[PDB]
Every structure is written in C-alpha cells, then in structure tokens.
Design a protein around this ligand. Structure first.
Ligand code: H4C
Length: 126
C-alpha cells in the first residue's frame, strides 16, 4: 500500500485573495473545529498505510483534511470562502462515504460538522 501525495497547499499560478469571509473561515470556522476533542482524525491526510486501510484511496478520490485546509488558509491559497467551504464539505463527506453509519469516526465527523454549520451561518458579508 501507498499514500498518495497530499493535496497541494501552494500553487503560484492559482489566483489568491485574503477576503474577510476567508479571514473568518480561519479565525472562527477552522479554529473552532481544530481545537475540538474529535478533531484529531481530521488534522492531517488520512494515512492509509499506518491505518492498514489499503482501500481508502481506492474509494476516496478527492481527499481533504483540516491540516490541508489550515495550510491553504495560512498560505492564502484560496480565492473565495466557497472554495474553502467546499474543502470542509469534502472532508466531512469523504468520512461518511468511506465509513459505516454508527462508526465512531462518523460520530466525530458529525460533531465537528454541527459546529462548522453553526459558524458558516454567521459568515460576514463581502
Ligand atoms: C488520524 C488517524 C485516522 C483514523 C481514522 C481516520 S484518520 N479516518 C477514517 N476515515 N476517515 C478518517 C478521517 C478511518 N477511521 C479512522 C478512525 C477514527 C477514530 C477511531 C477509529 C478509526 Cl479507525
């Protein structure tokens, strides 16, 4: 088994901005999820070798994680909040796609997602 390369967090010819909605995604939306007791599986790319989950990346073709999302926010990778919000949703969705209802990991994802939804509710106007 092998892990793929992680998602890129740097791309010089990608257009970037530092919008207030994007400043908010880092300061409220990501920093809220990051500190949570259930954040740890989501803090780095899934290591399918360490976990002995050789199927992971045969199933999940758009991996995403908060380690990547954090690096993207810090390295001003994004153009808009919707690109960043899409990364969060991809992260949650991947978890639900790969894992069975009632798995501990799904309960963890579901806790974080509740907060995530609660924070994006008060995303400022651009
Ligand atoms: C940090 C190490 C990880 C463990 C797990 C990770 S990532 N995971 C998986 N699917 N999506 C994500 C993210 C596979 N299940 C787990 C996992 C999490 C909690 C308890 C047990 C497991 Cl087995």
């Amino acid at each position: 088994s092998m892990n793929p390369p992680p998602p890129e967090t740097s791309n010089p010819n990608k257009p970037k901005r530092q919008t207030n909605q994007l400043q908010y995604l880092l300061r409220v939306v990501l920093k809220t999820l990051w500190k949570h007791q259930f954040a740890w599986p989501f803090q780095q790319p899934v290591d399918a070798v360490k976990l002995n989950l050789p199927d992971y990346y045969k199933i999940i073709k758009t991996p995403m994680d908060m380690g990547t999302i954090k690096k993207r926010l810090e390295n001003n990778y994004y153009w808009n909040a919707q690109e960043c919000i899409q990364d969060f949703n991809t992260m949650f969705t991947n978890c639900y796609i790969y894992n069975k209802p009632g798995d501990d990991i799904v309960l963890m994802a579901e806790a974080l997602e509740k907060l995530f939804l609660q924070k994006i509710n008060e995303l400022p106007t651009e």
